[PDB]
Each structure stands twice: as structure tokens, then as C-alpha cells.
Amino acid sequence: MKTPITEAIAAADTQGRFLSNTELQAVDGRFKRAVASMEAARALTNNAQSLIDGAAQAVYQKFPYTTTMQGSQYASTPEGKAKCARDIGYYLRMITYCLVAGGTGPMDEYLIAGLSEINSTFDLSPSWYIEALKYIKANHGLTGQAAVEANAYIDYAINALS
Amino acid sequence: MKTPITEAIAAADTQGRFLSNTELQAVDGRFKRAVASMEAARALTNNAQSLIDGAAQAVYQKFPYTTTMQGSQYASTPEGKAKCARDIGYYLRMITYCLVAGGTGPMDEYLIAGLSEINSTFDLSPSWYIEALKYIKANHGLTGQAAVEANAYIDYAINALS
Amino acid sequence: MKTPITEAIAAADTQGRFLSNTELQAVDGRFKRAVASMEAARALTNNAQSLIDGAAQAVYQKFPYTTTMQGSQYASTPEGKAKCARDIGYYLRMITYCLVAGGTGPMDEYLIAGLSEINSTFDLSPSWYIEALKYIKANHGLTGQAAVEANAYIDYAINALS
Amino acid sequence: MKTPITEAIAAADTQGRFLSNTELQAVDGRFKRAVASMEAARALTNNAQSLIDGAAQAVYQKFPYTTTMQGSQYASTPEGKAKCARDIGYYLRMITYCLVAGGTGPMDEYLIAGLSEINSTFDLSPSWYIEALKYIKANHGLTGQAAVEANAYIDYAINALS
Amino acid sequence: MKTPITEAIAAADTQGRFLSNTELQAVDGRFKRAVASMEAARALTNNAQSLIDGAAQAVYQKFPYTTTMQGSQYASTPEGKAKCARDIGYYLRMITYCLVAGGTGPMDEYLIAGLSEINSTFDLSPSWYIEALKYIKANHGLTGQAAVEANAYIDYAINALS
Amino acid sequence: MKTPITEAIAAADTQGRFLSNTELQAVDGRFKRAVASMEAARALTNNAQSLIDGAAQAVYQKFPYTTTMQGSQYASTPEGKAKCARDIGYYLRMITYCLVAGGTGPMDEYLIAGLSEINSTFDLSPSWYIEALKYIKANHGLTGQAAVEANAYIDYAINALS
Amino acid sequence: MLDAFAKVVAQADARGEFLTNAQFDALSNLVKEGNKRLDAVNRITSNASTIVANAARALFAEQPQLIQPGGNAYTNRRMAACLRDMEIILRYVTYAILAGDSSVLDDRCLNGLRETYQALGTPGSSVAVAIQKMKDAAIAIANDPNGITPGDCSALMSEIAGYFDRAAAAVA
Amino acid sequence: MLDAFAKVVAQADARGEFLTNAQFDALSNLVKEGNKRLDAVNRITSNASTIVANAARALFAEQPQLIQPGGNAYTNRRMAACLRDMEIILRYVTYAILAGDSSVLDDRCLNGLRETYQALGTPGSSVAVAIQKMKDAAIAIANDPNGITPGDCSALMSEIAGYFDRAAAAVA
Amino acid sequence: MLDAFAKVVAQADARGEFLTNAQFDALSNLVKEGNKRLDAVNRITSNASTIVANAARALFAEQPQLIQPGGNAYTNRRMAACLRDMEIILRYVTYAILAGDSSVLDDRCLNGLRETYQALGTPGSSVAVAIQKMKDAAIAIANDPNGITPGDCSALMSEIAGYFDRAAAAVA
Amino acid sequence: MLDAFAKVVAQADARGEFLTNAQFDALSNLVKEGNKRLDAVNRITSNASTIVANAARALFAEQPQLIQPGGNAYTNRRMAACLRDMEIILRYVTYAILAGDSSVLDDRCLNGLRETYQALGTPGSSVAVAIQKMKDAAIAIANDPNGITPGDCSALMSEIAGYFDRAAAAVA
Amino acid sequence: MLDAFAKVVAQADARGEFLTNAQFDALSNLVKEGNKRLDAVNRITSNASTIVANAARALFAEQPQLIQPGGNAYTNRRMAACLRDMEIILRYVTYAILAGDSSVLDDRCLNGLRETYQALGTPGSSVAVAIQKMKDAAIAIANDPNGITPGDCSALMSEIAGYFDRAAAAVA
Amino acid sequence: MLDAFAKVVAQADARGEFLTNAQFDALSNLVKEGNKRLDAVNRITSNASTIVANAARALFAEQPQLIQPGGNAYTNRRMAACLRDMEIILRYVTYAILAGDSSVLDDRCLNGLRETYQALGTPGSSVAVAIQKMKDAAIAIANDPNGITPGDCSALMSEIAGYFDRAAAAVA
Ligand SMILES: *[C@@H](C)[C@H]1/C(=C/c2[nH]c(/C=C3N=C(/C=C4\NC(=O)C(CC)=C4C)C(C)=C\3CCC(=O)O)c(CCC(=O)O)c2C)NC(=O)[C@@H]1C
Helix, strand or coil: CCCHHHHHHHHHHHCCCCCCHHHHHHHHHHHHHHHHHHHHHHHHHHCHHHHHHHHHHHHHHHCCHHHHCCCCCCCCCHHHHHHHHHHHHHHHHHHHHHHHHCCCHHHHHHHHCCHHHHHHHCCCCHHHHHHHHHHHHHHCCCCHHHHHHHHHHHHHHHHHCC | CCCHHHHHHHHHHHCCCCCCHHHHHHHHHHHHHHHHHHHHHHHHHHCHHHHHHHHHHHHHHHCCHHHHCCCCCCCCCHHHHHHHHHHHHHHHHHHHHHHHHCCCHHHHHHHHCCHHHHHHHCCCCHHHHHHHHHHHHHHCCCCHHHHHHHHHHHHHHHHHCC | CCCHHHHHHHHHHHCCCCCCHHHHHHHHHHHHHHHHHHHHHHHHHHCHHHHHHHHHHHHHHHCCHHHHCCCCCCCCCHHHHHHHHHHHHHHHHHHHHHHHHCCCHHHHHHHHCCHHHHHHHCCCCHHHHHHHHHHHHHHCCCCHHHHHHHHHHHHHHHHHCC | CCCHHHHHHHHHHHCCCCCCHHHHHHHHHHHHHHHHHHHHHHHHHHCHHHHHHHHHHHHHHHCCHHHHCCCCCCCCCHHHHHHHHHHHHHHHHHHHHHHHHCCCHHHHHHHHCCHHHHHHHCCCCHHHHHHHHHHHHHHCCCCHHHHHHHHHHHHHHHHHCC | CCCHHHHHHHHHHHCCCCCCHHHHHHHHHHHHHHHHHHHHHHHHHHCHHHHHHHHHHHHHHHCCHHHHCCCCCCCCCHHHHHHHHHHHHHHHHHHHHHHHHCCCHHHHHHHHCCHHHHHHHCCCCHHHHHHHHHHHHHHCCCCHHHHHHHHHHHHHHHHHCC | CCCHHHHHHHHHHHCCCCCCHHHHHHHHHHHHHHHHHHHHHHHHHHCHHHHHHHHHHHHHHHCCHHHHCCCCCCCCCHHHHHHHHHHHHHHHHHHHHHHHHCCCHHHHHHHHCCHHHHHHHCCCCHHHHHHHHHHHHHHCCCCHHHHHHHHHHHHHHHHHCC | CCCHHHHHHHHHHHHCCCCCHHHHHHHHHHHHCHHHHHHHHHHHHHCHHHHHHHHHHHHHHHCHHHCCCCCCCCCHHHHHHHHHHHHHHHHHHHHHHHHCCCHHHHHHHHCCHHHHHHHHCCCHHHHHHHHHHHHHHHHHHHCCCCCCCCCCCHHHHHHHHHHHHHHHHCCC | CCCHHHHHHHHHHHHCCCCCHHHHHHHHHHHHCHHHHHHHHHHHHHCHHHHHHHHHHHHHHHCHHHCCCCCCCCCHHHHHHHHHHHHHHHHHHHHHHHHCCCHHHHHHHHCCHHHHHHHHCCCHHHHHHHHHHHHHHHHHHHCCCCCCCCCCCHHHHHHHHHHHHHHHHCCC | CCCHHHHHHHHHHHHCCCCCHHHHHHHHHHHHCHHHHHHHHHHHHHCHHHHHHHHHHHHHHHCHHHCCCCCCCCCHHHHHHHHHHHHHHHHHHHHHHHHCCCHHHHHHHHCCHHHHHHHHCCCHHHHHHHHHHHHHHHHHHHCCCCCCCCCCCHHHHHHHHHHHHHHHHCCC | CCCHHHHHHHHHHHHCCCCCHHHHHHHHHHHHCHHHHHHHHHHHHHCHHHHHHHHHHHHHHHCHHHCCCCCCCCCHHHHHHHHHHHHHHHHHHHHHHHHCCCHHHHHHHHCCHHHHHHHHCCCHHHHHHHHHHHHHHHHHHHCCCCCCCCCCCHHHHHHHHHHHHHHHHCCC | CCCHHHHHHHHHHHHCCCCCHHHHHHHHHHHHCHHHHHHHHHHHHHCHHHHHHHHHHHHHHHCHHHCCCCCCCCCHHHHHHHHHHHHHHHHHHHHHHHHCCCHHHHHHHHCCHHHHHHHHCCCHHHHHHHHHHHHHHHHHHHCCCCCCCCCCCHHHHHHHHHHHHHHHHCCC | CCCHHHHHHHHHHHHCCCCCHHHHHHHHHHHHCHHHHHHHHHHHHHCHHHHHHHHHHHHHHHCHHHCCCCCCCCCHHHHHHHHHHHHHHHHHHHHHHHHCCCHHHHHHHHCCHHHHHHHHCCCHHHHHHHHHHHHHHHHHHHCCCCCCCCCCCHHHHHHHHHHHHHHHHCCC
């Protein structure tokens, strides 16, 4: 999985050599940044439910047709609404993983790989998720570097969706 | 050239993607470590001459035969002694480059590549340089993290020579 | 470009040999089918405007939000509606090319290659085009083998969009 | 084995896609041609013996030395004459296989592959077989497209032998 | 061109090294054998015409049909007989080249490469040349190692033809 | 293992062909040279001890520091002196193997491969071995071609060490 | 691979004999039903996406544990692989229908598949359900009387069912 | 590469327009002459070996210096290459006849050929004679009235002559 | 490639001298502005998609002929290539900003680009407009006072503008 | 490969749950001991050559039969391989120390090693002695109180000992 | 691979000793018989084609079922393979004769051959007959007293017989 | 590549004629001087390292600017390349001496060398001095009267000088 640490050893490994000061400074770089990352992860996790419930509504508000239109890809049914909230929880949960790990690794393996295929096969619209992510971005309530860390991964998700 | 920064972009480039938080933490890692690195580089540069003159003597003291034996590879001639001090200055100069750059890059391109070939062709003994480096290691007069930085590159040279 | 004829010579060419009875039967196969293909192409071309104008409305009827919602990707503006009709004409025009050529070639090079990238970048929804194609499918007014030919390429487009 | 049908799926398979109208027209091409092919195959099979007995004589007539000369590669012995008729039957039998299959496949795998090696190792002359094939070509008694099919494969054999 | 000398340097060259005692013994091996080789070459060259005129007749004697049969590939015409003698001279001339060079090189580049293609395209029979070579083999009049050298290359030709 | 004989068959094998006169002359080349090679091998083997004891002293005489200096890489201890004589015996023994085999093969596999790594890891100086080899070169007491053979392999070792 | 025609040729050769009137008549009949075979392939192929997507939705509604966290189809990477596998199974089945022989399906798709799922930890029996599903939809779409000349396709449908059952049995 | 059909499509697209009745009618006519085009290709292809061999014999009888020692066709290696080149020229010409377009001939055979012979030291004009020869034989064999339904093939023959002249001009 | 630090080292070596206090002081200052450089890269990179998409829309509204049939950006294949090229130009520009040196941009992106568009038939000057556009958006997003500690980034912005102008000049 | 952080993430996901305060607290502690981990790696790595060379000398003094003629370390080729193997074992052990997880050591170094020595005829137990040796030297050099800020590193040392024992057990 | 000379060297080394007079004398004798060994190889090699062709004819006359339809040597592809295999067996046997050691024959020809025929369905015992045949012809041609200096070659012939029996036993 | 023998053969063939007594006599003489040629190669090759090292030392003492910082031989990488180039020039020169023809030297070493140094920025004339040097040492070592049967080698030495001058002229 892609983290500042695995990236550091992979580099040394391909060149078939021992770790050097070059790689070590990178790991200390992540170690020092962990403080702000952990703070973000903690806050997102403690407020998971309200952010998820808020984000879902933001989506339904912006794209009202996803609640009335008929089809299994929409949330016009209690089942569709459960799947929808579930998917949102998946996104939120993945960005906290990225904060704890210090890299995009978790999101890349678990969510980005195969994304476009899935959204294509089940007629799911990207803008639906981009909307939910923007809501989480504007309301996580974090400040300082904790916000920069959180936003870094939210925006990363936004780009994968566009 | 291999630096924490070029390593960061090379990684992103091979994966054909934009820089992420992963790489950025690595660069901030080097940025924060630069303070101790620069201090080392400065001290080594201001005391270049005495460390060089000291290291040469340490070599002649340990391997007295390099001053009496006849052959162009030895310092038994004023010419040989100039080449010898010159070579020592090359080593010292290269480790300061590594401190300023934040990586082994400078030393790797300018000194390690081709080293064994050269020492083999001109009958130069590695232990001669390992001795000079140990002297610089014990007498640079640095303390704290500035010493750890300096020693990191000195030892790196020692290993390439053995 | 991929046609029953270029496919026939490509096969012979990779095997580095002369055309044989195998390839020739394939070309005669397309020659005999051309009659129904040309009939389809002709009918689609003579009724281009009404099918295009009909298909656009079918899209606006099914996804009413594409006419009211604000954003350049929607047809909530005279400009957006022109782009929309233009895109529909592109699809129709491409399937006639496939009928005349006897293969998917035209559509593959001119429309399928890069499709997903485009729909992703400009926030265009596939179901919008799948809807327009279904309308053309139900109203081209063709019968017999001329309909089978037309539908073969319409469905081919549908699959590329899903 | 190479047939209009296996060629059609191989093409689709390498491109990793589903069959399209392109390939289907090729199979219908062979399906429609089968009528003339089957007629040829049937006629050649019902008159196998006389064509074989006729072709052998034509060879002995043109190259009289193959009946008097001494050596196991010649038909100057009852054994050599049996091998000779046998080989002719092999050629005839293979062209009927090509007619039934709709391609050169059968002949390519069973007869062309390794041909030159064999004729070289056992001192068999190609012109001997080209002569036998020309006889079958002038006397199969077929007309119309049934003759074109038969001749297509006979000539194909002639070329492999020259 | 393939000679004991070029083979010796090619081996050293692929291994990217200087010639060693291994390769040198090989060159001295050819140097010592040159005496018998040169003797063979000289004798074959001084008796070229009679051996050529003898070999041609031997071919016509064994395969009388090559003088009566009609076709440009046969010597049933003054032109065909000139081509035939010419071809024989080519074979003889090539084996002397092999003796002077100390290897098959000359024959390989000038005669073996493309042989089967040519004999196939112009309906020339290998046994015709094998017969001419056997005549030269039985009548060159050489003895001792000079005969072993000559025969080595004659047989080499025989094998390429079968 | 690299010998004039294995080199001869390897060449034929890569070209996927039978041995020819080219390769055979090379083997006879080695066969004829074996006489001088065997004489060298025999003489070196019968005088192994004195040459070894002489060569060791020559090394200690030229590089007196290897007997007084402290460290396990030097012969300043009875153990170090045993290792030293042992290593010399290895060199001598390997050149006799090369004489018997007719090539560098034995030395290449058993001594050259990995040499530089070893001398580097255990701080052994090449000039120490080059000195021992020069002694053996000046005192083997061989003359004529037997000396040329012996010297060929001694010098070969010298070059690998420089 | 072989098509129904080359299959007969290969059998004739191993015996070293010409085709018999029975064989000619039999092969002549395959040619007569050609039109029905082209329609089957066209229709199924023309609804490829719908068949795969609808079958998977059903699979997941029937076995929700495949998509719960930890399930073999959990995460978009494993899900895409699952959908890909289904489309691939369907693709090789349509080749067999065109060929009139399962060889292509066996050599290039079914062999080693069981070993592959065993090693990956994929519930092979769950795959069988997936394919059983496409089978029903595929056949339903193949012999739908609307839109074409009426006639009997029952034999072709039973053959089409064979290749599907053949794949399902190769992983279950 | 393109066939006469895709060629029209590519022109229509660059303008962004549907096909016109003129174009439909024109392409509909190519389909009508299809039978003549299949016969041309079959016959020429069916006499590939004879065409190459007979043309080369003539070339060599006309320019004996090509086979004298030192000549570019002297030695079996250079001779095989010569014959190979002829068969290759003929092969790409038959592809163009099937396609009804010279693109395949131009992109995959003719371009870079002149540069290739210049660099090799091969008399390009001598190659032109070789191909001119196959041209005459090819056409002679293509429209031989014996063995087929009578009718006019004059337009096809003139087109066939074009591809041959096109190749000859590309090396001369 | 080189970063601003290795660039000084390479110059020092070619002369065979140690770094001077001027150089130490100069490089020590780059370290002090590090935070501003990390923010610039993060922000631009964080709005990659928007920057490319919005710039292209503008390009096409300004030069509609690029998307008319026959235009170099007509058809989804050429359009995807166009968008890809823009994202690639932007990607290498952000590498230069992290490095503090244009080497990576020059060696791995700009060289051979002019030749490449010339040969493809792509209006290089049109590309320049595209990049000029991303430049304005990129900088607008880089030094937006909202969301971060206040301070002067003017020098960094001017440097950032340099790499953009550098790429635009390499194709125009 | 995984580092101690991704290891927790992977476990959290398979269950489909967010991290718990226990986990946050646990991972927050790894971050606190980071400095000790960087020092361990730096020191061991900084004495790579000495560690390998001194350990091998001891191995050979303890088991002289490995270097007698016929021994598995006899001849410079086999000796270089031996030394190389030791340096490689040490290299992957330092990666695990940086990562805080043995995955990289297991996947890219230890698996298949036992099979490899069995097939080569190399005394696997002799390798175990070699690594046991580097273990003692490595740890001795890692927690030497001279030259650094005082404090407890006992837990890290015990972890470091684990990876070494883990490799030794994988070949013995 | 090894030749009789390197074979002795390899044994001497594993013991770490110089060659003994017995060994010198033994190897000195191989050199003395060199001429006979060069003649053997030259003659056999010089009749390669005849040996293979005549042996195969006999094999087929003895076991006609190998060439009946369905037989493993039926069809020119399988027949060419058969002849190729024979020529290859003969080729490696002549290498062993030059080398004076069967190593090259064992490592590069005989190992895996039995497994290969088992898997292909080729009657390995039939191959043994083929090689037995070439053996008799090869030796007959090797020590034919006509055309060379008289003397005893009996020991060499018995050695030559060994390599042939060695190959036959490796497939039977 | 060609050796002096194949060189004559190639000339004879292009004319289509047998060798003349002049040619036989000429080639018969090369064979007579064979011993001198083997000694030349053995000696030079036997002092490869000394020749390169001593020549380079002299080059650097004569042109110290090549090793000053910034010089083309400054840094161990460029220095190793320099030494490598010298050893390579010497290696191909010894091949020519064995062959008795400069072809191998020209085709595989000298051609493109001038272009290569021009592009690299390496003072080609400085290389010429390097090789001139090895020339003098090489010849000095080749015809040293000590250690061998006396006789005249003057012609061989002049030929040996030719290949060296030939290489020097190819870069200067
Ligand atoms: C110019 C772009 C704008 C601007 C920048 C500005 N930034 C800071 C300070 C900080 N920036 C960071 C950001 C990072 N550190 C990292 O390691 C990473 C990668 C993960 C990033 C993105 C940090 C940690 C700081 C310091 C803490 C803080 O939040 O202040 C400054 C202040 C510098 C100082 O300390 O004096 C400034 C001025 N300011 C503007 O007005 C422009 C719009």
C-alpha cells in the first residue's frame, strides 16, 4: 500500500541498496506531519454520522431527481437511500484511512481502482459523489493544518471523480 | 541528481501522476532537516584546510609505507603528496555537497560511480581513504544533529570503499 | 479503419501470405449484405432531421433536469441545446458511416475512442445518449434486414456507453 | 484450424471484444458459399478412385523415369507405386477437407507444414505432385462455382509446391 | 564471413574480452592445417575444366531425361547446358574458397543461403547437384589429408542439398 | 567450463548445426599445443612447494608491512601466514588447471568470478598477489613454448588483478 | 480451436478416410440453420451489458455477503474483476455459439479457471449462480418471437444452454 | 489502410456531412461489380508462383548483367531476395485490388522502398521492369474469357493496371 | 533533473570549489520560503481537473474551428489527446514548482514538443493560448488569501508564472 | 508490503469500520517513538559493511569446512554469493525496522529462501548462524549509549531482535 | 558442459589437490588418440543426412503403424518433427564424441526428453529403435578401413557406442 | 568482418574467378609468418593493463586540464569511461592483428566514433594522443628480442603500426 514509508523503501529496493539519509528525511517528514493528520482523522471519525447524514441530504437537495426517478440506481426507494448513505460512508471512511496512513494508498486500492468501471456499469453519476464530498469539505469544522490535511484527500477524491 | 526532492517527483512521474500529500511530506521532511545539514556543511567548509591537512597526516601515520615506497601511486614524492591531499579535498568537498543537496546524489555521480575501477587501475588502496574519512569523522568538532548529518555521509563513503 | 475488407487483408498480411478462399468468402459476405446496409443508411440519412429533433426531445422528456439545471453541461441554454442536438447528429451520422463501410470502424475511430474520457471531463451523462439512441431505435421506421443492420450499430453504441 | 469461422473469432478475441456485424457478415459469407463447396467435395469424393488412378498414370506418363529408375523414392517397384497412389489420395482427400471446412486450414496443418522438409529428405520431386494436381484439375468434371471452389484449393496446393 | 579466425574473435568479442590462449590455439590450429587445404585448393583449381566437364556428363548419364525433356530448367538446349556447366563451376569454385579460407563461410554466404528457395522456384533438382559433387569427390585425384580437406567440403555441400 | 573444445561445440550449438571443419581445426589446434601445456603443468606441479614458499617471501620482502601490521587481513600472525600461503597455492594450482584444460575456464569459474568483491570485503591488496605471480613468472625455470604457455596464464591472472 | 466443420474433418483424418454421405448430410444441415445461429449471436451480443449488469444485481441481492466488507466482491477493484469475469464468460460462450463447438470455450476460458478461483479464494459456486443467471436472460433474449421471421429455434436454444451449463460446471 | 468504402466515409466526416445520393449511387455500383473483383483476385493469386517465376526469367534474359558475378542478383541469397521482393510487390497489389484503394499498397509497401534500394545499391529501374512484366501476365490471366461468365471487366483491368504502374513509378 | 539545490552544487563542482557564504545564505533562504512553495503545489494540484477543463472550454469558445469537423480537436480521440496534453503540461509545471528549477520541465516535457506538433499538424500557437489560460487560473488559485496564514508570496507567483510562459514559448 | 500504519488500516477495512480510540492511541504512540526508530536504522545501515564482514569471519572461524575445498563457500564465486546473501538479509531487516512490520521482509526475502538453499545444497542452518551473528552486532551498535540523547530503546531493540530471529527461523 | 579434460580438473579441485602422474599420463593419452577422434566426428558428421534418412526408412518399414493415419509420425508436420528429433539426437552425440564426455549430451539433450515424449504421446521406445539404428550406421561409417591410415580404433568405437546407448536408454 | 584470407576470397568472387598462383603464393606466405603474428597478439594482450594505465598517466601529465575540475576526464565516472575507451581501442586493434585485416576494427569500433565524441564534447584529438601512446608501448613490447626465437618481424610491426594510426586518424 502506498504510504510515505513504503514509497521510501520501494525506492531503495529497486535501486537494490540500503536506506540512506534521503529516504530517512522523508519518513521523518511524515512523522512530523502525523500530528495534524491524526487530529483530522479523529475529528472526521467522531462526527462521521452527522457528516454522512448531512452529505446525503446535500446530494438529494442538489439533484432532486435522484429521489423521485424510478430505477435501482436512484435513491427513490428506502433500499436506494441505504446504498447511497453506505457509499458516502465508504468515501468518508477511506479519507480517514489516508490520514492515518499518511498517503493515498488506502483510497487508491480500495476505492479508485475500478471506480469508473463501477459508476459506468451501475449508472451512478460522479457529480453525485463530488457533491457529497464538497459538503464534507465545507462542514468538517477543522481549522489550520488539520483542515489542509483533510482537504488534501477530499480534493484528491474529487479529481479521481472528474 | 538524487535528492529528496528529485526522488519525490521521479516517483510521481513513473506512476504518471500529480504530486500528492505523500510526496509533499517528504519534501517538508527535507526542508525541516536542512537546518542541521546547512550547519554541518558550513562548519566543514570553514575548516576545510585543517581537516584536510590533518587527515592526510593521519593516513601517512597509519600507513607509513605510502611515504617511503617508490611508485607513482604513493605519496613518496611532492607530486604524490599533492595528488593525495587533492583526493582528500575531493572527498570532503563531496560530503558538503550531499549536505546542501540533502542526499547522496552529488557523491554518487561524482565519486562513487567508477570508484572501484579507478582504485584498481591506479593501484590506490581503499583503506587509505577510509582512514582519512575516520579522521574527519572524529575531528569535525560538530555536535547534536549536525554531527549525525555529517557522519551519515562520511559512513556512506566508508561503505562504498568497503 | 475496421471493415470486413480491411480485416480480411490484415489477417492475410500478418500471416505474411496471399489472400485465400477463406478471406474472399468474407468479402463476398459483406458484398451480399451491403444491399440491406445501404437501404438502412439511405433511410437514416433522408430522415436525419426529424429523428434528431425527435431524439433530443425524448432526452429532455426523460431527464427534465437537463433543461432547467444551471451549468454549461446542460441544455438549459440555447447554446447547450445546440451542442446537444449537434452531439445527437454526430451519433446518427456515425451509424450511417458504419452501414456504408460494413463495420464498426468509423464509429470506433471517430466516436468510441476517448468517449469515457470526454463524458467524464465535461460532466456529460451516458444515459442521456443511451436514451437518444433508444428513440432512434424505436422510430427509424425500417423493417426486415434493414432494421437488423440499423439496430446492430445502435446497440453497439449503447454498449460502448454502458 | 483455419476456417472462415475460426478466423472471425480469433480476430475478435485478440482485440478482446465481442463479435460484431463485421465478423458476422464473414460467417454468412462462408455459409452462402458452402453450397458450391459441398457440391465440389461430394463430386471429388464419389470419383476419388478414378481421379487417383488417372492422376498416377499422368505422372508416370510425364516422368517415365520414375517407373524404371532404381531407388526407394521411385515407383519402379510395386511398393513404390502403392506409396505413390497413397500420396495422391492424401492430396485429393485434403482438398475435400478444405471444401467442407471452407478454408485452407486442413491442408495447412496436415500437408503444407513440413512439406519441403519431407520432399527434401526422401528425394521426392514437387513437379511430380504438381503434375498429379493438374490432372485432377482438368478432369474433375465440375462446372460453374463448384469448379471455382475445387480449383481454388488445387492451385493453392500447386503454389505450396513451387 | 565464417572462418576459424573470425569465429575466434567473435567469441572473444561477445564476451567483451581480449583474445586468450584458448582462441590463439584455434588460429594456430587452422594455420597448421592450411598446408593440406592449400594443396587441395591448388589441385582443384588447376583441374577445374576437366572436373567440371566430367561432372556435367556424369549428371547427364545418371539422369538422361535432363537432356531430352523440354523446359527451360533442363539442359535439353545449348542454353540449358551452358547454365548447367556454369552452376557446376559455381559449386567447384566455392569449395576452393572454403579451402583457402579454412571454413564453410564462403559457401554459406554465397551458395547455401537461399539454395532451397532457388531450387524450388526454378524447378532444379538437388540430386542433380549431389550427383555432380559425387563425381568430383571420386575423381579429384587427391590423396592423404589433402583429400580429407577436399571431401570435407564436398560432403558439406551434399548435406545442404539433402 | 571454457576450453578450446567446449568453445568449439558451443559455437556450433548456438548456430544449431553440426560441427564443421572450422571447429575441428580448432580442436586439433589445442591437441597439438597440449604437449607444451602438459610439460608446463607437470613442472609447476612438481615444484609447487618451493615456488609457493618462494613467492610468499617475495611478497613479504616487497611489502614488509604485511608482516608487522596488526589486523586479520595481514600475515603478522601464524594464522595470517597460513592463509597467505594457502591463497598462493590456490593461484598456482589454478594456472596448472588452465594448462591441462587448455583454457582460462578453470581460473575464470574458480578464481576470477567474485575476485574484486572478495579483495574488497576482506581488505586484501591485489598488488600482493601480482607480486607473488611475478615471482613465479621469473622462477618457474621453464623454457621454450612451455614457458610461453605458463606465462600466458600467469599474465592473464595479473590482468584480472589490475 | 475448432468449429463444427473442422471437428468433423479432424475425425475423418485420424481415420484416414473421406467424408460419408451421413457426414455430408449432417454438415449440410448445419448450413441450413445458419440464419438462426447468426440471430442468436447478434441478439445476445447486442444485449451484452444488460445481461451482465442485471445478472450481477441479482447475484448480489441473493448473496449480500459477497459485497459486505471482507466479501470477495467488496471494494471496486474486486467488483470490477467480478463484472469483468462475467463479461468474459459471456464472450467465450458467444464464440462457441458461432462456432458450433465448445473447444474455444474450453481451451481459452474454462481450463485452469477452477484452479484460479481456488487460489484466489473466490467462491466458485457463487460464480456458477452468476452464469446460470446470464443463461436464462441470454436464452430469453435469443428466442423472443418479436422482431423476426417465425420458426423453430428449440434445438439451437438447447445447444446454447449446453455451453452455459458447461461453464457453470467448470467452476462450481 | 482504407478500402474504397471507408475512403468515402473519411471524406464525408472531415466535412461533417452525411453521404449524398451521388455517393450512395457510386458506392452501390462498386457492390454491383463485386463479382468481377473477386474473380480478378482469385485468378491472379491462383497463379502467383507462375507470374513471379516467368517474369524473373524474362528479366534475367533481358538484363544478364544482374546475374553475372558482381551483379545485384548474383549468389542465391541476393536472388532469393529479388524473387521475394517480386512476390511481395505482387502480394500488396492484390490487396489493393480487393480493397479498391491503393492505401495499403502505399503505406505498407511502396513508401521507403526507393530509399531502401538506393541504400542497398539495387537498380531500382530494373525492379520497374520486373513489375511491368508481372503486370502484363497478371492482367492477361485476369481477363481471360475462358472458364467464366462473359461480360465486361475493362474498367477493373484498367484499375488493376494502375496499382502496378503505381508501384513501378515508386522505385524507377 | 535538478532541484534548485543540486543546481548550485553542479555549478560549484564544475569549478572545483566549496560553496560560498553568498550561496549558503541564498540556499538557506529557499528553505525559509519552503512553506509557501508546498502550499502553491498543493492548491494547484488540488484543482487540477477544474483548471484543465475550464481552460479548454474557454479555448474552444474562443477558437470554435478547433472543434468543427476537420479541426484538430474534432472527434473524441483528438479531444482526449488535447485534454491529456494540457494535464501533462500542468503536471510538469507543478514538478518545476516543487523543484525550484525548470530542468524537469525542459528535459521531460518541452523538448521535442514543437517538432511533435509541427509533424502532427497541431496549431502550436493554439496550445500556447491553452497554457496561458491555466497560468491565470493556477496563479489565481495559488495566491488566494482565503484559507491560509497571511504573508507575501509575490516572488513565488512570479516564478510560477515563469514556468508557464516557458512552456507557452516552447510551442508557439 | 505494509508499514505498521497501513497494517491497522487493512484490518479496519476488512471489518468495514472506522478506527477506535485504542487504535488511534496505539498508532499515535508509534509516532512518538519515531526518533528512536530513525536512529536504529541509521546506525545499523551506517555500519553495514563491518557487520557483514565481521559476522562472516566468525562464521568461517567457527565452521572452517565451509571454506575448505568442496565447501559451499569455497571459490570466490560461492564466497561472494555468501557475502551477498548476508548483506541482502541485513538490507531487508532494516526495511522492516523502518516500516515497523515484517511484511516486506517476508514477501520479498524470506519466502522461497528455504526451498532455494535446499535445491542449491547450501547448509541452511549455517546461514542461521550467520544471521544470528549480525543480530548481536546490529543490536550492539543500535543501542550504544554513546553519541546520542539518553532514553529507553529496549522495546525497539526487542522488536529488532524479532525480525532477525524471524529470518534465521526461515532457513534453519 | 565439460570435456574429458575439464572433467578431471573439476574433480581435482573439489579435493583441492594438484593432478597426479596417473592423471597426467591418462590425459596425455587422450591427446595421443586425438587423430582418431577427429576422424570419427568428421566421418559421421559427413554422412549426417544419409544416417538419419536411412534409419527412419527402416524404422517405418519395421513399424508401419507410426505412419498410418493417426500414427504419431502421420502428416508431414509430425514427420518433419520426427526427422528433426533424430538429427538432433545425432548432433548432440557427435558433440560428446569431440568432448570425450557425455555432459553436453545429458544437460542439453537427454534431460526432460522422457517427460516430453510422455506428454506428447510419442512412443519413446520407438525413438530408441530409431537411435539404435543410427548407432549401427554411425559406427559402421566411423571405423571403415578404406580411405585412411590403418590402426586400432576399437576403444573409441566402444565409447561412441556408449553415448548412443545412453540416449536410447533415456527415452525407452 | 573479414580476415586476410576471406578478403581475397571476396575479391575473387565479385569477379567470378578462381584464385591465381600469385594469390595462392601470397596467402601461402601469410601462413608462413603465422608464428610471428601469434606472438605479437599474445605479448600485447599479455600486457593490456600496463599499456593502458601507463599511456593514460602520460596523457594526463601532458594535458592536466583533462583532469582539472570541468575537464572531460574529471570525476571517476568520466575517468573510468576514458580508461574503458582506451582498453576498447586496444582490444579491437589486437583483433585486427590476428585477422590481418582492419575490417573488424572499422565496422565495430571506428565508425561513428568521431560523431560520438563530437556529440559528447570529448576532445577527439586528445584521444589520438592516448592511442599514439599505446602504439609505441605496444610495438615496443611486441618486438622485444628477449624471450623468443630471433628473426625479422619488421613487416608485421609496420602493419601493427597501421591499425593504430588508422584508429588515431578516425577521431582526431
Ligand atoms: C502563498 C501560497 C499564500 C500564503 C502562504 C503561506 N503559508 C504559510 C505557512 C505554512 N504553510 C504550511 C503548509 C504545508 N506544510 C506542509 O508540510 C505541507 C504538505 C503536506 C503543506 C501544504 C504550513 C505547515 C505552514 C506553517 C503553519 C501555518 O499554518 O502557518 C505562511 C506563513 C509562514 C510563516 O510561518 O511566517 C504563508 C504566508 N499566504 C498568503 O497570503 C498567500 C495566499
